[PDB]
């Protein structure tokens, strides 16, 4: 190195090039994977992360843990990105993608150390991934019966498998049944915004309930609200986007009068405007009034005198859910409140749940919505319950899209490894080593399962390999029995697209990391 009186790049620029840079990238990826290794399988463990402000997040989802990890290593951020991608496209497998990518990089590290050209590794990864995806699509088990009970059972089993790694795994059957019930009453888009999730502190997990309708929290009642009845047996719900209170007619409106008679007339006109709106609401026959905009004390007292229920400042999402449940239409104007735009539910009732008041709309026969009311002993408990239910909901939605499943517990990946090794045995030999390394790396998930469970991973892997070699596709890891078992007959089912996306994303991440040869870091401006 020479001073070079006028330097080429900006002062402080840091560069790294060659094999050591790639080896460091692989090591960083391994470090990232080590942070979520233990959160895989029924015997997984939660992770607690504290931010700068001091709020603690307890989670088992790999994507959440990686997001909470403020990773700044350019090669390591690829694992976080692919975890986010798997969460977005599928919703489950965020740990598997990271483990697979890191294991791929670790397996090809010795070949990189001896100066193997990266493009050969990239081509081998592409070929192996294409073959694995084709094999998964070929051997995935699907039933062409279109039976309602059979598909319900399949969705329930998939949800149970997707839930048997979280803190709600003890009540996994109960939660899976509720999740399947909630998903099956969505119409065609399966929008997540159409499934409300309410968390109420205090109560056992089994106290959580699914509302065949809509339910939301009480919203800042005014004076005179306590005189309103809180139960109806055939109410008509008026869904409104209207501010029902005295106020200026317009922001730019100005009133100019020169007679006290005109003054009194103006005051009476304002009062008559509000009372005309209220009379139009009353004559519509509705007994429950819901408004996005605030509802004043005058309107609250008016509705109390007429024995009605009013609730202003209802959020947009809750109003839309109520529309989809009762079956009305949000009206920004009360001038045409026909019976067509009035929601209808069997029973409306306000009750107390864990020291809070919740308005309940139940008995809707044509509802297209739900509302999960989750009970727990802590805020993070409820947050993790919501995360687990979200994973289950995404899994059930994907299974609704297509009923193509493979046995979990590492059985699918053991079969893929066997097939890939058999394929690699019949090629020249430069790609054979790399494809064999890919197949060997595919074994990480059952090994990680055994390690988390406390098994001896070597014996379990040997037994699985011997079984798959002699036939038997769906033999995975029996966690309870300390042994192996046919996981398909044990109903350890997952959608095939989960593993397909996991393999695709892991392969793409590995190829992207391997392709990079030089890292350049410009100095950061505005050091402050």
């Amino acid at each position: 190195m020479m001073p070079t009186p006028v330097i080429l790049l900006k002062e402080g620029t840091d560069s790294s090039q060659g094999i050591p840079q790639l080896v460091s990238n692989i090591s960083a990826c391994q470090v990232i994977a080590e942070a979520v290794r233990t959160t895989l399988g029924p015997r997984g463990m939660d992770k607690l992360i504290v931010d700068g402000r001091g709020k603690a997040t307890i989670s088992n989802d790999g994507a959440t843990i990686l997001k909470l990890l403020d990773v700044v290593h350019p090669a390591a951020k690829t694992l976080v990105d692919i975890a986010k991608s798997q969460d977005a496209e599928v919703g489950d497998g965020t740990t598997s993608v990271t483990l697979l990518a890191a294991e791929f990089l670790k397996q090809v590290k010795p070949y990189v150390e001896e100066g193997l050209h990266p493009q050969i590794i990239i081509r081998a990864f592409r070929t192996a991934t294409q073959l694995a995806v084709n094999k998964i699509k070929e051997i995935a088990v699907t039933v062409k019966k279109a039976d309602k009970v059979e598909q319900r059972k399949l969705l329930e089993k998939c949800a149970m498998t997707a839930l048997s790694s979280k803190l709600i795994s003890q009540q996994k059957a109960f939660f899976a049944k509720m999740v399947v019930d909630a998903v099956m009453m969505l119409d065609d888009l399966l929008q997540l915004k159409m499934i409300g999730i309410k968390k109420v502190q205090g109560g056992a997990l089994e106290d959580s309930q699914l509302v065949a309708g809509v339910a939301f929290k009480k919203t800042f009642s005014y004076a005179g609200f306590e005189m309103q009845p809180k139960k109806y047996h055939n109410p008509k719900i008026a869904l409104l986007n209207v501010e029902l209170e005295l106020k200026a007619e317009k922001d730019n409106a100005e009133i100019r009068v020169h007679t006290v008679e005109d003054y009194q007339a103006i005051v009476d006109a304002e009062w008559n405007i509000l009372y005309d709106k209220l009379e139009k609401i009353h004559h519509s026959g509705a007994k429950v009034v819901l408004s996005k905009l605030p509802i004043g004390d005058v309107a609250t007292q008016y509705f109390a005198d007429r024995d009605m229920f009013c609730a202003g400042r209802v959020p947009e999402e809750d109003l839309k859910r109520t529309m989809m449940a009762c079956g009305g239409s949000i009206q920004t104007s009360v001038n045409a409140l026909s019976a067509d735009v009035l929601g209808r539910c069997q029973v409306f009732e306000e009750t107390q749940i864990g020291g809070e008041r919740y308005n309940f709309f139940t008995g809707c026969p044509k509802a297209k919505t739900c509302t999960f009311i989750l009970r727990g002993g802590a805020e993070q408990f409820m947050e993790e319950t919501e995360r687990s239910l979200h994973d289950a909901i995404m899994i059930v939605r994907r299974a609704i899209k297509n009923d193509s499943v493979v046995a979990g517990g590492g059985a699918i990946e053991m079969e893929l490894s066997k097939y890939l090794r058999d394929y690699s045995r019949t090629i020249p030999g430069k790609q054979q080593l790399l494809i064999g390394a890919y197949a060997k790396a595919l074994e990480i998930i059952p090994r990680q399962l055994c390690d988390n469970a406390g098994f001896d991973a070597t014996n379990i892997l040997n037994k699985l390999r011997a079984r798959h070699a002699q036939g038997g596709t769906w033999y995975g890891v029996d966690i309870n029995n300390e042994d192996i078992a046919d996981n398909f007959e044990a109903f350890v089912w997952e959608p095939a697209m989960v593993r397909i996306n996991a393999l695709t994303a892991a392969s793409e991440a590995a190829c992207l990391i391997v392709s990079v040869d030089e890292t350049i870091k410009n100095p950061r401006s505005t050091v402050d």
Partner: protein
């Protein structure tokens, strides 16, 4: 690490200042912190429990026995301590009583789980065993529960339950009186068809001075305000109250309004209009036959003097919730303007009086003797504000217990009898299960047995000997009501001693403690900055 090639190795932003606990050492640290919190809490358990005296960041002092309040005001930094605080608060919101038992039970569970882990058992297996034992204990509690009558015709079981709840608090000097007023407050305002008890209709508020025995239940509303004009009478009988939310001022449009005076005639007309509006509003109020007028937004001198002149006592600036409570109690509607005021919208009250409080110049208005007042208020007196706050939270605990009785009318006998019986059932069940979860179930039973031990320790008796004797008696004679004689009454049968606890409270305690212990056992890494 800094790479094997010596090149810089940065992964996590500011990883030098961050810390990480890995594996079983982190779990041991969590268990020890939770044990410390639980052992701090366990001294305030039972009738002989001692109160903690908390000081906030501003120097304000709170002498209290409520576990939830103590943990809420405790300034902790450990995450597991925050989890304990949240668990106690959750038990408070869901039930309102037993916020101290949950913390002690969770601490005992984690303490047993520590020595279970030391022997090489995966924490997930411990959590599964705890869940199984909790299911067994809950089923046993359902089996051994007993039902009580919750009718207004006879309130003895309710009074006994409220007395049991209030025994541990400082208001035990006025024990039966506080229990009776809490029971009457709950029963007066409640929907008899097993529906909710709206706590917003119970106005609990206290004033310093007097004696704690002077705390009373008013079947009406007590208002901080007083009569606007000092020369109006302080006593109104058979009052026909007119609740109004419109200030006794000339009307004013909400819209931006300009009134233009262009001549002397206009000025005279405006002055006459103001005078006539005042007189008209007063005459409109008087035309309904009302005796008392209650306003929310105050009024000016002219309205005040016309109200005085027409023998109309009035009160101004009454709060919105106070207006609602008065309207509910007096059976009268809330009228937004005078033109809509009619005789049918008037409330009724047998007595409206102004209350003095010694040499303090402060006056308070009481409305009572209503016809069928659906709203009640509790007026607490004390020798200092600290005992007043403690009485407030103790009465809240009693109200919550009676509310739970309203929701479900099944009770179990406290004093450790329920916990001892549950431990016996869990131990009996564990003898039949495969030995792998047997250790976890036995540890759960041992943790369940900490409540009677803590009760005996607080009462001065030897814990192990008393607990063993009571358990042996429970096994010998099949009486699951035998507990720890904390008050030294000379007997162990809590069914005879009338120590009664709601079944819902015990079930919530067991469930919440089990779930929190499971969550703590499932955490293995921490990444504090």
């Amino acid at each position: 690490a800094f790479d094997e090639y010596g090149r810089p190795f940065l992964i996590i932003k500011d990883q030098d200042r961050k810390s990480r606990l890995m594996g079983l050492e982190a779990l041991k640290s969590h268990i020890m912190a939770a044990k410390a919190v639980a052992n701090t809490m366990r001294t305030s358990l039972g009738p002989n429990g001692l109160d903690k005296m908390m000081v906030d960041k501003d120097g304000d002092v709170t002498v209290t026995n409520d576990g939830a309040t103590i943990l809420s005001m405790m300034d902790v930094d450990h995450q597991i301590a925050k989890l304990m605080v949240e668990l106690s608060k959750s038990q408070d919101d869901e039930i309102g009583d037993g916020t101290t038992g949950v913390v002690v039970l969770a601490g005992a569970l984690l303490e047993e789980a520590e020595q279970l882990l030391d022997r090489g058992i995966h924490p997930i297996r411990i959590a599964d065993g705890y869940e199984q034992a909790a299911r067994v204990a809950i089923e046993h509690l359902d089996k051994i529960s007993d039902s009580v009558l919750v009718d207004i015709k006879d309130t003895e079981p309710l009074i006994q339950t409220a007395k049991t709840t209030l025994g541990s608090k400082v208001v035990n000097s006025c024990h039966r009186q506080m229990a009776e007023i809490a029971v009457n407050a709950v029963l007066t305002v409640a929907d008899m068809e097993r529906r909710d008890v709206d706590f917003e209709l119970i106005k609990v508020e206290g004033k310093v001075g007097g004696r704690l025995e002077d705390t009373k239940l008013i079947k009406g509303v007590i208002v901080d305000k007083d009569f606007s004009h000092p020369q109006m009478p302080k006593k109104v009988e058979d009052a026909k109250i007119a609740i109004l939310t419109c200030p006794f001022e000339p009307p004013k449009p909400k819209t931006k309004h300009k009134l233009d005076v262009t001549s002397v005639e206009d000025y005279k007309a405006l002055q006459k209009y103001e005078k006539e509006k005042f007189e008209e509003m007063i005459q409109q109020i008087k035309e309904t036959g009302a005796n008392l007028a209650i306003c929310q937004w105050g009024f000016d001198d002219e309205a005040n003097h016309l109200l005085l002149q027409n023998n109309l006592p009035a009160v101004r600036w009454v709060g919105g919730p106070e207006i609602e409570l008065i309207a509910i109690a007096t059976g009268g509607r809330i009228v937004p303007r005078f033109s809509e005021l009619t005789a049918e919208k008037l409330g009724f009250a047998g007595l409206v009086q102004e209350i003095s409080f010694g040499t303090t110049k402060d006056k308070m208005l009481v409305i009572e003797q209503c016809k069928n007042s659906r709203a009640v208020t509790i007026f607490i007196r004390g020798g200092n504000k600290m005992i007043i706050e403690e009485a407030k939270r103790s009465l809240h605990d009693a109200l919550c217990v009676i509310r739970n009785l309203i929701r479900d009318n099944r009770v179990v006998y406290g004093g450790g009898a329920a916990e001892i019986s549950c431990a016996l059932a869990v131990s009996q069940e564990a003898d039949k299960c495969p030995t792998l979860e047997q250790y976890a179930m036995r540890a759960f039973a041992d943790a369940l047995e900490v409540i009677p031990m803590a009760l005996s320790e607080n009462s001065g008796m030897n814990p192990i000997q008393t607990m063993t004797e009571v358990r042996a008696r429970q096994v010998k004679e099949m009486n699951p009501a035998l507990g720890i004689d904390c008050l030294h009454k000379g007997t162990n049968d809590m069914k005879q001693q009338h120590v009664i606890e709601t079944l819902i409270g015990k079930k919530q305690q067991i469930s919440l403690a089990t779930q929190m212990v499971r969550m703590i056992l499932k955490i293995d890494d921490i990444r504090k900055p």
